[PDB]
Amino acid sequence: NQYDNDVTVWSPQGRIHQIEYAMEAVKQGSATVGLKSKTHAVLVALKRAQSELAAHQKKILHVDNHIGISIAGLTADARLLCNFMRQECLDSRFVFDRPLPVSRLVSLIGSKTQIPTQRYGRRPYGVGLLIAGYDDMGPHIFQTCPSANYFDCRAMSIGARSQSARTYLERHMSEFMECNLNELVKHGLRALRETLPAEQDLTTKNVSIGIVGKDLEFTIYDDDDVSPFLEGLEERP
């Protein structure tokens, strides 16, 4: 209706419609799966190429040695949030010489995103972040939706056609905890492959894998590096 223009206007039913639209902004992007085992937090994302002869868009970004993200939403807000998280991680390293906890960084992201959803002047951060990191309490896989609310999830999946990945992760949640790096990556790849249509297949040119573990720093695998993980995946029925 007429309560659909600003984030500072309350609908009669009790909803800030602009926040709902910012949340919808996530589904316009590629599907991303983030999951964590006991010692590893691997997140697999699908990369979309604007043209056949254009490099596939970066989807898994680097924040710090122990904090990785997947961006499913606006490129502008995704990059801004990535830069802010990079600055927060660098500040924590400089002042504390200790890896900034993933939970605290996620809370800071939520606090920073809340302000745009409460004061006129800028639109809500229309990017859904899947934060994966390793800290003293083990792997963490958070999702920071544009509504300024983040959920600590075992294996979340945002973006277009992400419902299939979420259903597969719900089905196979049990095995995730007691799984190695290879099995965790394979389950994440299966979750992503479920999202794709029948024709498309998980090729080495459109899959990005990020892993943070007990003694392994964040690694972003693109192109051939994904090949060792991709090979051996069961052919889709």
């Binding site: 007429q2 309560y3 984030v7 500072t8 206007v9 309350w10 609908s11 009669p12 039913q13 009790g14 909803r15 800030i16 809370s107 939520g110 606090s111 995103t113 809340q114 302000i115 959803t117 409460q118 004061r119 006129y120 002047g121 509504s147 300024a148 609310n149 983040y150 959920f151 600590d152 999830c153 075992r154 294996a155 979340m156 979420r166 992760l169 719900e170 949640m173």
Partner: protein, 240 residues
Amino acid sequence: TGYDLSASTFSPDGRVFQVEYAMKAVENSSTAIGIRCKDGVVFGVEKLVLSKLYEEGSNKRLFNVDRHVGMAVAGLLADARSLADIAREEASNFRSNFGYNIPLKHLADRVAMYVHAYTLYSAVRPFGCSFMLGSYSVNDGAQLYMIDPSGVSYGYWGCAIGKARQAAKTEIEKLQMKEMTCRDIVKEVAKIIYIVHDEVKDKAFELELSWVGELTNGRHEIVPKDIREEAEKYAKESLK
């Protein structure tokens, strides 16, 4: 219509509509009940797990404003978290500038003034979350204050914020909070929360409790898991 697009425009009959809309928004969320023992304050919020992929503790609605102050926000979680941050900031500033724990009454008044300051400007919108503050101190007893989006905040013996506020109050008025201790009151809180639950409209929920009083040396901490189950056992004993 017409007078309800901004929070700074008084309605013709004299009511700031955006504040009422925020009150409705908080009314659209799950229940959270705070019951004051004879020797403490107990918080209980039904935390609905929107999906099975959550980590059994994600987006918890029980926030520690300070060492002795517990907050039981219910409504828009982002606004609740922002309010928790502001409350922590106010508590820290009060302790730094005065040296002693900010009284629950004064912290509640300052946070309520902050909340009300966001329903007076056109460039900002009222907070969509109602919160209750609880604390215990031998010097000043146990206090339980609830501040809604309107900014009003007076003390309560026991309050419920959320969908089934009226249902919670119906079975909370049937509890003697004047004399009971914070040991059986936790079981009572669990039972009352379990009574106020659709269970056919809401798929599932993860009860989370909290308390602050003499039994906790005056500090507010998550109810121990050993005794939290006992409250869950009592709630299950209650058929509803």
